[PDB]
From a paper:
Copper-containing nitrous oxide reductase catalyzes a 2-electron reduction of the green-house gas N2O to yield N2. It contains two metal centers, the binuclear electron transfer site CuA, and the unique, tetranuclear CuZ center that is the site of substrate binding. MnN2OR forms the typical head-to-tail homodimer, with the N-terminal, seven-bladed β-propeller domain of one monomer in close contact with the C-terminal cupredoxin domain of the other. At the interface of both domains, the CuA site closely approaches the CuZ cluster of the other subunit to form a combined active site that is accessible via a hydrophobic substrate channel running along the subunit interface, with a water-filled cavity behind the CuZ cluster.
Hypothesizing that many reported discrepancies in the structural data may be due to radiation damage during data collection, we determined the structure of anoxically isolated Marinobacter nauticus N2OR from diffraction data obtained with low-intensity X-rays from an in-house rotating anode generator and an image plate detector. Diffraction data from a plate-like single crystal of MnN2OR were collected using Cu Kα radiation (λ = 1.5418 Å) on a rotating anode X-ray generator with a mar345dtb image plate detector at a temperature of 100 K. The crystal belonged to the triclinic space group P1 and diffracted beyond the detector edge at the minimal possible crystal-to-detector distance, yielding data to 1.5 Å resolution with a mean I/σ(I) of 2.6 in the highest resolution shell. The two N2OR dimers of the asymmetric unit indeed differed in the conformation of residue H579, which was a ligand to CuA1 in the A protomer of both dimers (IN conformation), but rotated toward S546 in protomer B (OUT-conformation). While the environment of CuA2 changed only with respect to C618, the missing H579 now caused CuA1 to move almost fully into the plane of C614, C618, and M625, so that the coordination geometry became trigonal planar, while the environment of CuA2 remained trigonal pyramidal. Contrary to the IN- and OUT-conformations of the CuA sites, the four individual observations of CuZ were indistinguishable in the low-dose structure, where CuZ consistently was a [4Cu: 2S] site, with a largely symmetric Cu2S2 diamond core that is reminiscent of CuA. In the present analysis of MnN2OR, the Ca2+ site was fully defined and showed a typical coordination environment that in essence was octahedral but included two bidentate ligands, E260 and D274. The second ion-binding site in N2OR thus holds a K+ ion that plays a very specific role in connecting the CuA and CuZ sites, integrating them into a single functional active site within N2OR. Our analysis of the anomalous scattering properties of all ion sites supports an assignment as Cl– rather than S2–, but its influence on the properties of CuZ—if any—remains to be understood.
Author numbering:
A (entry chain B), B (entry chain A): 63 to 634
The structure:
Amino acid sequence: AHVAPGELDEYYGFWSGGHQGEVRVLGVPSMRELMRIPVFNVDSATGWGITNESKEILGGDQQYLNGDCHHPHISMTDGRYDGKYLFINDKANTRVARIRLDIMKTDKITHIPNVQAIHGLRLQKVPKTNYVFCNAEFVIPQPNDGTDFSLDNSYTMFTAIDAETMDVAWQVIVDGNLDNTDADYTGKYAASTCYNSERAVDLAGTMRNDRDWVVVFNVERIAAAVKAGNFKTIGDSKVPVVDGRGESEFTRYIPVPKNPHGLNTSPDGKYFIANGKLSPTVSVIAIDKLDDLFEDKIELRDTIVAEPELGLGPLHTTFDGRGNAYTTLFIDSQVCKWNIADAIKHYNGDRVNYIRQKLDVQYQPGHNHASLTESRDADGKWLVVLSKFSKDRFLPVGPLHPENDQLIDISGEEMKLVHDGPTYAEPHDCILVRRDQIKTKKIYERNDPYFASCRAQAEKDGVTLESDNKVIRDGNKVRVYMTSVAPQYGMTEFKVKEGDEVTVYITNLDMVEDVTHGFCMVNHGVSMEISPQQTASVTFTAGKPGVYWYYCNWFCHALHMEMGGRMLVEKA
Amino acid sequence: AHVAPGELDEYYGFWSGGHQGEVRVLGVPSMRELMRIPVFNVDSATGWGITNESKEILGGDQQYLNGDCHHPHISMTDGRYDGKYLFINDKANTRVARIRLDIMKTDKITHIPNVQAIHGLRLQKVPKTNYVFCNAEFVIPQPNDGTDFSLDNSYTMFTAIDAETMDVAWQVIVDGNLDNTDADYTGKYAASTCYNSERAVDLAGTMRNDRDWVVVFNVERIAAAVKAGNFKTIGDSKVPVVDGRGESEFTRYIPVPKNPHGLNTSPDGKYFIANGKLSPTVSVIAIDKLDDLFEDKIELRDTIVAEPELGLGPLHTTFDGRGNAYTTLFIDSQVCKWNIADAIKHYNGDRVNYIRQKLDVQYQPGHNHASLTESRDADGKWLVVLSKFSKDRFLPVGPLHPENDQLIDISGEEMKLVHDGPTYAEPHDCILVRRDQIKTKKIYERNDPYFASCRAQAEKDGVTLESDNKVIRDGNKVRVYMTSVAPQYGMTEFKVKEGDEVTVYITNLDMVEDVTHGFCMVNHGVSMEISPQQTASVTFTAGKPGVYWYYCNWFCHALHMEMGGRMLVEKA
Ligand code: CUA
Ligand code: CUA
Ligand SMILES: [Ca+2]
Ligand SMILES: [Ca+2]
Ligand SMILES: [Ca+2]
Ligand SMILES: [Ca+2]
Ligand SMILES: [Cl-]
Ligand SMILES: [Cl-]
Ligand code: NA
Ligand code: NA
Ligand code: NA
């Protein structure tokens, strides 16, 4: 449970940042934050959102200073984590990101078309992560062009992204809406919860139906229809769209009470578990019955093998790989341990006890996550419970309180609280991976894709980034290329005109690990990271005439304070 | 050392974020981050830098997405922390911020005129914090208007800000430059290091002189000259400027080797200690000799009562209140405990031993900070050492590594490492305060200054913020006022035209602690916090015609997912 100085954590944890927009890398079981990976936020330090390279990745037709990331998931090969990529949603500005786990940096951002608010996200497990599966939460008109605002004619879609290219593969129109999603251990099926079968905005409307549903997607049938050309398109997007509304070959709508929320696949591949939320239950769907259901051989509700009452406000379920499930009860403010097989007996009227233990948590739990739960190798060691209120649990810090991520030992029969982890607004889910499932680089190589655009521009200017310190004049544009070797930039002054569009490229020629440099231009609103063997750039408009200093903002050497230069801006 | 679940930390720590731009609130000795206070960064979650209230506080004539904050200090009454305000510098875009410690929010940002790169910052101690003292690091022409770029005619200034108004009080022109600063325990004196007596840009130039100096400011004389009207002004600023160059009544330039860096006041009020950096020394200046020096009764170097050799790269010194000092050695990667009285005897020629202990730290230490060191109540319990490299100390996370903030027990004769704390780029200094020295509010009062502007606009529109759900049209502006009680906004639909300038005001009517609401407009790049009894607002341009959902992004209730609404944008 404890990590001494000089000792390493046993697992990485990748935490969502919620509306703060980043991913946080923790060591488990120390629960210490090792790194922040900027995604949808703008990072003053590394310049994510400021650098040209990050801006290229972000794309889009407007700058967004925010995002809302909930659901981080790591790429799999044959149902085991492979450590290549992390993917996460953006509910705020309707995007999905991919993070490269070799350098812990975002490398792709995709805008999802003709939907709003990407919420649920999880990955194909088997045969490997070929698809990223994405829910859009909020129904909108199709197309959304202002000619018809009616809810009556508003819909959402389920989206599959090609994991390797990050281009959207296809979308499925559904009835109702989409909340959370998971995938099976064959590649054939994915499934999502719906809380708004009513397609309402008002609170009473969203709660009218006694049951909403889990919608199950026959990914095999969908992919085949898309391959055959049996699809349509919406609006300005060329993405293939198939229609899963009503009675469709692509979907099954299994009724589940009530405004259900989490959707979690058991690590033995047997079950999708929908969390009942307004219903004090979960609903256990037998994946091995879905083939029969897609042939209309059984009823929709025949796939339900258990629907146990657990307590008030079930939100999310996770697994120890020993046959138990752990479910957050938001209103009762507990985590409930229960046995799946015993709940199945109870549903059948063989009235065994199925609840093993309720542990109070502090306070109001959202997601929970057991170590390796999303893989075949679910190890039953650690359980993280991510609670949304902290009240009195930490020192007072004003009206805005931290969240509380609690680490619980589930290695034995009895859940035991070990650590209370204050966290800034606002983690949703997290994912734990063994140390040995991640392989990182300690320095860049000069062909790295993270500065492909810099190499391409340098070639146009005949600049050798590893060697040159040059000022290139291009009309109202100026490109400044500098090398850096601690504690010196290879250029200590340059001159431009007021209003010039200045781009500064810095290449870090240091080879020693951890010798990162920075670059900041005083009063010009720019900063960037340049780690060993990286190139990075920033663009800014030169301000009113005068001297402006630049300096290294990454303490790098005893002579760091002296690592700088001057930009001289002349009257045009 | 250890804080169990349900127990509280004994100290607050306020960490600088460096070029990440925020202040981080830690519990000590657990070393867990309790809260982030946005300052110069743009926070996707709370909307700091997006909300109208934060934008008014930031002011300026352009948006900055970045800052570089090093030096957090808390307001004092008679040399004891009083818990009212924290102040911090911005090196990147030449600002100073004040944080209100009742709500843990920035409330004032001041742009410092006619200087670049605010670095050193510390507070008046006695009789209380009336002044904030600020160093500007980089010499610039006066005025900085592009007519003369020469270093020969470039200078910097020391700045005093009125702590209560946050308006600049006066500035002092100096020779050389300014790095770090501290104040005495009378109010009369402040002092700064200089590393660039050469006023050079090139590295060899900045290290040419064997000695630079500590510049001591006679604050009493300066304030008198200003009150008498004996000052000038620079450029377009009305701030009073006095000239402390050369032989001046306002300054004394005590030679100190070599490119000295930290400047630290001992808690008995006896010494200013300059950290030698390129010289393996510190220089101990006796404050009780300064009156004699300002009457020319002693020589400049007669104020030096010790100049002990400690080791390679001394950067920052801190104090246990027992007569020992603790100095970071950046090159040797150690913290050195030494006895001040013995160093004075050694300087006098006595055959004595002033070094007590060298502890290896991991790796390359910058600032260090002992609990209550900046006050009379320096308690000698804890020492934080903030190191700039972490190498192998934490799990690998790519080319960019965390920093390492180490917690050391200094309560006894032997310094003992207790904890290694990974931190994101890049803390400089921190300040520790007892739990009982901070008094926070849990909910807002409706007269709070943090939404005075919202109140004034509501009044003009005839709106009662605590009761109204109204849409106000004013040309092409739309002001939308809503109340909120989780899980329902008081308005679930509103209509605007494409291109309208839409301002949404939300007033949180929940009264229970920790029931924070949020607000996000999908695809419009806005988010904001609304904590209990707060009002907050965001402004955005309505996009292309269509439906856009808004939702609460602060998990607030079991029905959080249903806390939404729609903005309907029509073609103009
Ligand atoms: Cu490069 Cu500090
Ligand atoms: Cu309001 Cu969640
Ligand atoms: Ca419903
Ligand atoms: Ca919360
Ligand atoms: Ca010098
Ligand atoms: Ca570092
Ligand atoms: Cl889920
Ligand atoms: Cl200092
Ligand atoms: Na099959
Ligand atoms: Na089958
Ligand atoms: Na099969």
